[PDB]
């Protein structure tokens, strides 16, 4: 049986090939997670179909309806068999889906337009001239909503009521808002994506300060999946071979434009 | 029932208190993993007994007998219920025990005596004047034994036949060898331990170069354990609260002395 993979268009994890219009099926896509999916499938002995999550989201439980959206919802409601994506391992997600051991580390980080007078989360929290926000329906927004740490809770109180809205629907939208806001918007996003974007033309953004937390991305399966064990061992093998490190270098720094 | 915890004397994870002779049971010990054990036990609702692994080893399958030693052996053969220690998550261990998601990240790293003319693994591999080695019966030795990467395989070929032996029984022994060898021994160990020792008097050692790999420590349970799920969720909760970060700062840098 074909394993249905849910994933998300997020550079450099999954991207449309320039010539995608000329291609069919899995061959339309390229990136770190496209390469990882091929390796996991080879090691576990399955055939698969890459599908892009219909709503373009990572996944959160909707405030009103209590229904999971994004890739998490695709797994919870039986629409996909596995998620191979930069999907953060969290407690509330582990209650409803399984994760492999992590394939990549990350932490929440700050993106600024170059020259913005901000060095830290504390700096952001102590001012309002420079607006700041996060992606909707993902782990970064939930980090601020749940944090008991004074600085991060102060940031949440500001973000949740800021006008106009500081939240964005996609990473690309956060990046565009940093680039177009003349230093007046800073974006909170994962260090992996921040570091990729810092390498991309026109190299007008950068990561500042330390990471706010430390966590990982994992390959997720629905509870009860027969794939769980083999997928986990395959991630460990690919790490131990240095293949995950090779893929990070390939997609972050061999594509590097500054 | 009392949960029997296997752990290892490895600073700053588990250390004898200065006044341990005056104390009984769990109260004899202090450190990051002592604090972590108390938190995991509280969150999972169990009472526990800290025990120090009899052979002082992390764990490997003996070449001759194929019997697991160290903390891994304590779990495999039913002597302990859980390992709470800086125990690296590896494929061959995941086949025989379970691990939580990681509670800390690390990579293999190089420790030198200050002023040693070495900056990288490649530098070590291209010379023999400065001897270099690893801990026995752990994940670092196995990394070199199994590596297909040219520089690391060259290092393995040298280490496995070097005279006198470059391998040590405990981290303390590797550190002592670096300190007493006047620059003529470099020690390959995890970045966590390397960074701790760089802060300790007399501040005569340091970490050089990048990490050789990227991996994690996990809390381990024997296959079939009823503790597996609750332990994993407790690690995720402690991470999400910032408690793991607080404990790292407590044991590495709040008592650090350079
Ligand atoms: C949550 C923290 C503690 C920050 C963490 C620790 C380690 C990793 C990790 C990164 C890359 C590869 N691997 C291999 C599987 S692993 O050993 O389970 N962990 C990793 C990620 C996050
Ligand atoms: N990796 C995140 C999405 C990005 C973010 O929230 O910053 C998730 O799995 O929700
Ligand atoms: N953490 C390692 C021990 C230290 C090392 O091998 O450098 C293990 O679990 O085997």
Q: Which domains does chain A have, with CATH numbers?
A: 1-106+216-255 (3.40.190.10), 107-215 (3.40.190.10)
Nearest to B241 among A94, A148, A214 (CB): A148
Residues 6+ positions from A18 with CB-CB distance below 8 Å: none
C-alpha closest to that of B148 among A35, A237, A235, A45: A237
Nearest CA to ligand 1 atom 11: A104
Dihedral sign computed on CA atoms, order B219, A249, A170, A225 = negative
Mutation target among B144, B242, B249 for the A interface, most CBs of A within 10 A: B242
Nearest to B91 among A143, A213, A237 (CB): A237
C-alpha closest to that of B137 among B58, B191, B194: B58
8 A C-beta contact, residue A212 and residue A121: yes
8 A C-beta contact, residue A245 and residue A114: no
Which DSSP string do the residues of chain B spell out, in sequence order?
A: -PEEEEE--BTTTBEE-TTGGG--GGGGEESHHHHHHHHHHHHHT--EEEEE-TT-----B-TTT--B-HHHHHHHTTS-SEE-SS-B--HHHHTTEEEPSPSEEE-EEEEEETT-S--SHHHHHT-SSSEEE-BTTSHHHHHHHH--SHHHHHHHHHHHH-SS---BSSHHHHHHHHHHTTTSEEEEEEHHHHHHHHTSTT--EEEES--S--EEE--EEETT-TTHHHHHHHHHHHHHTTHHHHHHHHHHTSS---
Rounded Cα distance between B118 and B115, Å, is: 8
8 A C-beta contact, residue B101 and residue A99: yes
Rounded Cα distance between B190 and A233, Å, is: 22
Question: DSSP state, A224?
Answer: T
Rounded Cα distance between B249 and A258, Å, is: 35
B95 is in an annotated binding site: no
Rounded Cα distance between A47 and A3, Å, is: 6
Sort strands B215-217 and B131-133 into parallel, antiparallel or unpaired: unpaired
Using alpha carbons, list the distances in angstroms from residue A63 to A4, A39, A67, A68. Answer: 28, 37, 8, 10
List phi, psi (to 5°) of B35.
Answer: -65, -45
Q: Ligand 1: distance of its center to the CA of B103 in Å?
A: 8
Closest approach of chain B CAs to the CA of A218, in angstroms? Answer: 10
A94 vs B236: CB contact, 8 Å cut-off? Answer: yes
DSSP run (H or E) holding A170: none
Rounded Cα distance between A16 and B242, Å, is: 37
Rounded Cα distance between B162 and B226, Å, is: 45
Residue A215 Cα: closest atom of ligand 1? 1
Rounded Cα distance between B87 and B93, Å, is: 10
Query: What six digits make up the tokens of B15?
Result: 């250390």
Q: Ligand 3 in contact with B7 (CB < 6 A)?
A: no
Question: DSSP state, A212?
Answer: S
B213 vs A245: CB contact, 8 Å cut-off? Answer: yes
Question: From the centroid of its chain, how far is CA B225?
Answer: 23
> Which residues are paired to B48 by β-bridges?
B3
C-alpha closest to that of A56 among A139, A133, A167, A136: A136
8 A C-beta contact, residue B227 and residue B81: yes
Question: DSSP state, B258?
Answer: -
Rounded Cα distance between B17 and B24, Å, is: 11
A99 touches chain B (CB under 8 A): yes
Q: What share of chain A is helix, strand, coil (3-state, %, to 5)?
A: 40, 20, 40
C-alpha closest to that of B222 among B52, B75, B71: B75
Peptide bond into A172 cis (omega under 30): no
Q: Nearest 5°: CA angle at B105, between B104 and B111?
A: 115
Which DSSP string do the residues of A130-162 spell out, in sequence order?
A: SEEE-BTTSHHHHHHHH--SHHHHHHHHHHHH-
Q: Ligand 1: distance of its center to the CA of B102 in Å?
A: 6
C-alpha closest to that of B102 among A247, A103, A241: A103
H-only helix segments in B147-255: 150-161, 171-180, 191-198, 228-240, 243-252
Q: Ligand 3: distance of its center to the CA of A120 in Å?
A: 34
Rounded Cα distance between A74 and A87, Å, is: 13
Residues 6+ positions from B184 with CB-CB distance below 8 Å: B129, B130, B131
8 A C-beta contact, residue A170 and residue A135: yes
Sort strands A97-99 and A108-113 into parallel, antiparallel or unpaired: unpaired
């Amino acid at each position: 049986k074909t394993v249905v993979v849910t994933t998300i268009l997020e550079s450099p994890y999954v991207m449309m090939k320039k010539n995608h219009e000329m291609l069919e099926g899995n061959e339309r896509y390229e990136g770190y997670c496209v390469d990882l999916a091929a390796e996991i499938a080879k090691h576990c002995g399955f055939k698969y179909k890459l599908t892009i999550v219909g709503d373009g989201k990572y996944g959160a439980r909707d405030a009103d309806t209590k229904i999971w959206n994004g890739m998490v919802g695709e797994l919870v409601y039986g629409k996909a068999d596995i998620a191979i994506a930069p999907l953060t391992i969290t407690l509330v997600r582990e209650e409803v889906i399984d994760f492999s051991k992590p394939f990549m580390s990350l932490g929440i980080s700050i993106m600024i337009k170059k020259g913005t007078p901000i060095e830290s989360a504390e700096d952001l929290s102590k001012q309002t001239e420079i607006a700041y926000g996060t992606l909707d329906s993902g782990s970064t927004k939930e980090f601020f909503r749940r944090s008991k740490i004074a600085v991060f809770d102060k940031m949440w109180t500001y973000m949740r009521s800021a006008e106009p809205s500081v939240f964005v629907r996609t990473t690309a939208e956060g990046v565009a808002r940093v680039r177009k806001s003349k230093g007046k918007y800073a974006y909170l996003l994962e260090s992996t994506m921040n570091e990729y974007i810092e390498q991309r033309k026109p190299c007008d953004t950068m990561k500042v300060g330390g990471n706010l937390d430390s966590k990982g991305y994992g390959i997720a399966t629905p509870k009860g999946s027969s794939l769980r064990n083999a997928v986990n061992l395959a991630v460990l093998k690919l790490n131990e071979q240095g293949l995950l490190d090779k893929l990070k270098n390939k997609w972050w720094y061999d594509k590097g434009e500054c």
